[PDB]
């Protein structure tokens, strides 16, 4: 279900009508999008990984 | 070296997969809606008698 | 999900007869091939900028 | 709305047994669509019908070969090549060669889908599924066609019981047309006389109790309908004949889809095995229980293949177009705007199509053998 | 035979591998296009 919320599949998809829109902005994906590269960087800062 | 002589590089990694994703995935719908709005404004200005 | 774990890889490229004759001993059976049948225009799946 | 499990109950791909047997002979491009080979007959066979004959007397004779495949001692004595003290221009021989050929045909099929359908669909990954069933159907059809061609080009045919043609095959009478031990023994005799090479080797015994020795040197493919009859079959002295893979599982390698061993044949059950339906005498109310089928309102019996393939019998022609596809060229075009039919805007209705070339060459048809029979319910 | 190996690949094996792997690649190229 959490992956369903992030990727907009399953129940996360909006209902379909012929004469109306099907746009859903992605909040969870964005919130995680800064968190990823916020967290990854300390492990890639130097040539040596273990001290 | 003894390996396959190819080097593979992803832009946006997808967890547990070879390939990557560009940023068009996130932007296609916004591009369409913005284009529609701009066309509407040009229609207002162009059709009216001046 | 790892390129190193792959068992095989296949790549297609354009080449002329002079390139093959550059290293003669590496290649065999050059005479049997017909060049007209295998050309960039005849093979459609190959994607190129050649007119 | 409900809570779908998102598991996609799917059915796997049915196995194929005849196709791995067949070797593939490539057809080079720019050469037409036919393949031919020579066959050189021996000196002493009846197929050597030539005119270069001079008998030991010194006169011309019709038969170029000394004597045919005949084994009569008197005929051999009459037709021996003899020589004299001052021999010259007495015995002459002749040779011939025979050509064989096979050609190629074309198959293919597509399907259509729409943009609305592909996206608004509840299940995601639909096109992956549709591609999967497309490929499965293609492989199944390839197998069916190859099996049909092999069944049609069989060389040696043994009708079970006392029948003479498919029409004479019947399940009612003094002698019903079913398999018996003598038929298998005769088929072995014929195949040995045809010089067909053996496939398997004799199985000697193990040291564990109840294990039974098996001597079988050929592989026989039968359907699922005939297996109960093969199980109930009894040998000449009334004992059980079908020896299950149970007993010789030790000290032997059990092939795929093998039910058991009988006489000299290692039975290999094949799931998708074809059978002519409604080809036999008209069934009556005295049907002991054998399968029947409807033909133009009147019932008829069913004939079943029971086939064995010998080595070097045939090779399957193949045509590799382009240089990237060994058969099965696949195209898919998504229902975009440019992909709509030119008279229809709002791009929709993409499709996917596959096509392939198939053909078969029968090098020697004497090695293929076939026993027609009726199958019980 | 081009080489002296006991077991040699032959062209059918390679092309079979290519046609086995091709369906996934064909699906992937749709997204890039």
UniProtKB/Swiss-Prot annotation, chain A:
Subcellular location: Virion
Span within the parent record: 52 to 102 of 763
Function recorded in the entry: Forms the portal vertex of the capsid. This portal plays critical roles in head assembly, genome packaging, neck/tail attachment, and genome ejection. The portal protein multimerizes as a single ring-shaped homododecamer arranged around a central channel.
Designated name of the protein: Probable portal protein
Source organism (scientific name): Enterobacteria phage N4 (Bacteriophage N4)
Subunit structure: Homododecamer.
Curated annotation (Swiss-Prot), chain D:
Coiled coil: none
Pfam families in the cross-refs: Phage_capsid_4
Keyword Magnesium listed: no
Domain of life: Viruses
GO cellular component: viral capsid
Keywords: Capsid protein, Virion
Principal subcellular localization: virion
Localization in the cell: Virion
Role according to the record: Assembles, to form an icosahedral capsid with a T=9 symmetry, about 60 nm in diameter, and consisting of 535 capsid proteins.
Protein name as annotated: Major capsid protein
Organism this protein belongs to: Enterobacteria phage N4
